[PDB]
């Protein structure tokens, strides 16, 4: 849960010199990306996740 | 303070001598080959919210040589207007005629102004 | 064979259609020995915070377009570390690794030429007149060559079969260079050593050396192949030292 | 490196733009051991007649197409030799090789992604509600996702954010997969060992896996190129077995 | 400075089949000609360049 | 893989996307030997004026074109220090390198056969006839096959698919030969060395061979690919003697 103290950096993506296509060729194109982790992460402290909840059993 | 930057004048110049800070001036020139349709100076003045240039840049438009003078007793292979600098006009005589000088005269600038070469070929009977 | 990674500092780059590399004279960049040296104070090297990939802004490669020269250094003079050191210090010295990237279709063909000129001394356009600073470098915009004789007081002679040095554009071969053929590859890398006659020189006083890249065979395309081709050109000093340290210039 | 054959039986697999051949979590299909088997009676292992490639008609990507998804078996029960065994024996068990056909041009581009999902337990669409059988298999027709939320009684929830599981449907990376991207391979192979907590199961019952493949980045072409482009999905069994045999079930 | 006694022959390119593209590419392209002398070149005699003139001092 | 060079004589031949080098039947030329020999005197083997790589004009694929073929010798006949030796001299012999040389784009298809036949005796248009030798042989000109059954007295029965001879048009490949298939390679080898019954032979009487060059899948292209495309034939004497020498003969 990141603040301001344990900020991270930011992530920004330029052209360095652009996109060239013959003729007959689409014109728009597209990038994925795709996030893991190297060989050194690590996490730690349990807590519970905030992504899950319910209102009621059975469910 | 500093004025924005002046720009770029495409088949042309803008000379600088003295930064573009408050009061400097700049000047504008053309290649040869381009007439400038335009100011020929700009300088760093107050406007309104800011500082900024006295004139807005100029154009340099192409210098045009005029129709290649026809010839009697000849014929030119396909000719065109829009005659630009460095750009050519060929010649050719009629059936029974014989050619004599410059078979083809090119389009070249002088005093800023657009000048073909010699006189065209001469058709002989 | 044509792939190539080239990481200095913290910056990486990647290429996968490179020819190869051009060491100017066979000759790397090193740092001052101590028998070839003049000056009696210890060097500032930074190692990491300088020697490192700067990338000037890019150019658009046009139909009709003569070319264009940056002057290095002073191209990297605000350019993080390098152009701090740069200003805090009279005696200078660096190599460089410079990587040019052009990037077309199959469909797109062309061919530049990407040279390295030491010493490129410059002429005028008045033949009776004097240079300025700003005709020669206006700092990472790239100066742009002119397919005809040019005017104008004090900007120079940059017709581009003269090169801007009255020479012949065609014998630029002698000096490093490579080509960027749209066709085979869509980068050039030249790596320059320290070339000049003292063995450390001032940063702003001496424009070290010149890049010109000018297109031989220009642009073409068809139908609907992608109008806009652009430049970009990365640097990347090399065996960095700084020597005489007081306050910083200013221009 | 990209050249490939895949031979099971009597049957072939030549491909030339192949990228690799994930192999599910690095285990291979192998028969049932005699330590932890549990069925008494000798098995059935026919080995050429049922381990062969298969080939389920093709789709068709269109432009705005969300995806595609199989079961695995109950796709290949009325293939031959392998859709009889499994008719006449209570009890199966095999690994499959998927090899995943789609072939387009150079000025084509596009991404799908192949992946093989065990146990792709499915939602329906009315919440409190149940799927139907049909609803999760075609047999060789496949199911198709939508690119918006479904409606309708009975039939799976299958907007494809979500892939018909609840999930997000960029994670399936966690499942063995592939891509196939028109811009450089051709065909993607998964090579899917036996996944189930019991040593043999049914095989009229359980779904196995489900094999779903989701355009990420779709179609697209310029002025005349093919506006056809389809795929073509092959299954091959391996180390097949079967076991207690009585008369034929029917449905 | 060649005269017909010491000439040297002349080069000369034709196409051998021709120059064939798909749609959407150019049609006119270039070729270009780089000079160079190999291992087993020699010049001697030296004398002065007829390419440099001038017509009084401080030139 | 793909590169080749051959170098015969003062000639070079440079090639980048060439397929193999058919030799004929395992078989390189080579020269008389002393017990295979019949004639006494001494032969001529000028060895560099004559073994090296002739050009011959070249053709238009067209869209619509049935074929060509060539006679060797009866080609080479005016060419250089080939065609003199072969008038000066009773008795010749000879093998030969062709390569044939077309190349095309990556947006245009076609398929040719090159194929050289050894005595390629040929038949008249009209049954009860007999050919000329005009209408076996033009020199360097090639002759064409055509689409349909020719008529005219004198002239072969040039329709393609009977290729003349009376045999099968795509049976040919029992005979030396290649394709140039326009997706993969742009130029096909054949070493011929000299077959024949009898040690030497004359060279005006006995056209010991023919070249023919037979389209089986055509040209085709889109909107604005290169309409021509030509084909280009080279033919390089190999181990070439001669012998019995007088004055020199006429047509």
Chains 1, 5 share one sequence.
């Not at chain 1, 930011?10 to 994925?32: L, R």
């Not at chain 3, 066709?183 to 010149?210: E, G, K, L, Q, S």
Request: net charge negative.
């Amino acid at each position: 849960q990141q603040d301001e103290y344990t900020s991270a950096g930011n992530v920004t993506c330029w052209y360095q010199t652009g996109i060239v296509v013959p003729a007959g060729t689409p014109t728009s194109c597209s990038i994925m990306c795709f996030v893991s982790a190297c060989n050194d992460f690590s996490v730690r402290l349990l807590k519970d996740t905030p992504f899950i909840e319910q209102s009621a059993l059975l469910q | 303070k500093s004025c924005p930057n002046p720009g770029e004048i495409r088949n042309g110049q803008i000379d600088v001598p003295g930064g573009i800070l408050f009061g400097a001036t700049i000047s504008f020139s053309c290649n040869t080959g381009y007439k400038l349709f335009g100011s020929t100076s700009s300088f760093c003045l107050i406007s309104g919210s800011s500082v900024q240039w006295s004139d807005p840049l100029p154009e340099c438009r192409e210098i045009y040589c005029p129709a290649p003078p026809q010839i009697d007793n000849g014929i030119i292979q396909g000719e065109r207007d829009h005659y630009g600098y460095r750009q050519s006009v060929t010649y050719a005589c009629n059936k029974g005629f014989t050619m004599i000088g410059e078979h083809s005269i090119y389009c070249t600038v002088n005093n800023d102004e657009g000048e073909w070469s010699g006189p065209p070929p001469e058709c002989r009977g | 064979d044509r792939v190539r990674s080239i990481t200095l500092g913290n910056s990486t780059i990647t290429t996968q259609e490179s020819a190869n590399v051009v060491v100017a004279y066979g000759r790397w960049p090193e740092y001052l020995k101590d028998n070839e040296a003049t000056a009696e104070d210890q060097p500032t090297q930074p190692d990491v915070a300088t020697c490192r990939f700067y990338t000037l802004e890019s150019v658009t490669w046009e139909r009709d377009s003569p070319g264009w020269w940056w002057k290095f250094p002073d191209a990297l003079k605000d350019m993080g570390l390098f152009g701090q050191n740069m200003y805090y210090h009279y005696l200078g010295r660096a190599g460089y690794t410079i990587h040019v990237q052009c990037n077309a279709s199959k469909f797109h063909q062309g061919c530049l030429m990407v040279v390295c000129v030491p010493e490129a001394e410059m002429g005028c356009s008045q033949v009776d007149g004097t240079v300025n600073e700003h005709s020669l470098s206006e700092g990472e915009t790239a100066k742009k060559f002119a397919s005809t004789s040019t005017n104008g007081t004090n900007t120079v002679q940059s017709i581009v079969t003269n090169a801007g040095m009255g020479v012949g554009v065609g014998n630029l071969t002698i000096f490093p260079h490579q080509w960027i053929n749209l066709r085979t590859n869509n980068c050039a890398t030249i790596v320059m050593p320290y070339i000049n006659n003292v063995p450390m020189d001032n940063m702003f006083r001496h424009h070290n050396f010149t890049l010109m890249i000018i297109p031989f065979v220009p642009l073409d395309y068809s139908s609907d192949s992608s109008t806009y081709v652009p430049i970009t050109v990365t640097v990347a000093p090399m065996c960095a030292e700084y020597n005489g340290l007081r306050l910083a210039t200013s221009l």
